[PDB]
Amino acid sequence: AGNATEVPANSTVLSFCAFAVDAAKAYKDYLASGGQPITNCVKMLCTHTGTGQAITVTPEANMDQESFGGASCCLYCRCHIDHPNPKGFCDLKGKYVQIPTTCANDPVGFTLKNTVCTVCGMWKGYGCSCD
């Protein structure tokens, strides 16, 4: 009974971060040791004529981004572990995340390392025009 959610390619990294005290550090160290990025993310078929904002209610990918389902880009949702923010709730689950095409191979790692500009809503270093 039940429906499989994962593929065998993710078993090692998911089990490693599922047991870690600091899962974010464990994932970054896993990548640094030559480990493969988490795969089986929710990649969207979209027009690519969107605003380009980082976290949206609908896919807003532009010609330089790929749109993904938010929960699938969150290490804490992927491992089924506690979220690090004090309220314990997710900011990616329930939304779509726009990831630059050059970083689309590792969406979970991209969201773990980068921040969204509170002014323009674009990723810092990847679309934020502000100073």
Partner 1 sequence: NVTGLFKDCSKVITGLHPTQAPTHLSVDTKFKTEGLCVDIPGIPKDMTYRRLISMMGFKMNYQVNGYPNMFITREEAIRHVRAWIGFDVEGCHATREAVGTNLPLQLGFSTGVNLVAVPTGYVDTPNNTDFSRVSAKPPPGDQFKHLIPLMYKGLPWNVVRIKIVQMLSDTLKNLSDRVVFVLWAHGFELTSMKYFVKIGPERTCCLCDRRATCFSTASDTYACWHHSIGFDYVYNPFMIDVQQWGFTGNLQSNHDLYCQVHGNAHVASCDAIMTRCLAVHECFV
Ligand X SMILES: O=C1N[C@H](c2ccccc2)CO1
* 103 in contact with partner 1 (CB under 8 A): no
Among 72, 111, 116, 123, the residue binding partner 1 under the rule CB under 8 A is 72
Minimal distance, residue 79 CB to partner 1, in Å: 8
Q: Measured from the CB atom, is 57 or 130 closer to partner 1? A: 57
Q: What DSSP string runs through 47-111? A: -S-S---SEESS----TTEEEEESGGG-HHHHHT---SSTT---SSTTSEEEEEGGGTT-HHHHH
Among 26, 74, 99, 116, the residue binding Zn ion under the rule CB under 5 A is 74
Query: What is the chain's alpha carbon radius of gyration, rounded to the nearest angstrom?
Result: 15
- Partner whose binding site includes residue 70, from ligand X, partner 1, Zn ion, none (CB under 5 to 8 Å by kind): partner 1
CB 128 within 8 A of CB 122: yes
**Residue stretches of the annotated binding site for Zn(2+):** 74, 77, 83, 90, 117, 120, 128, 130
Interface with Zn ion (CB under 5 A): 74, 76-77, 90, 93, 117, 119-120, 128, 130
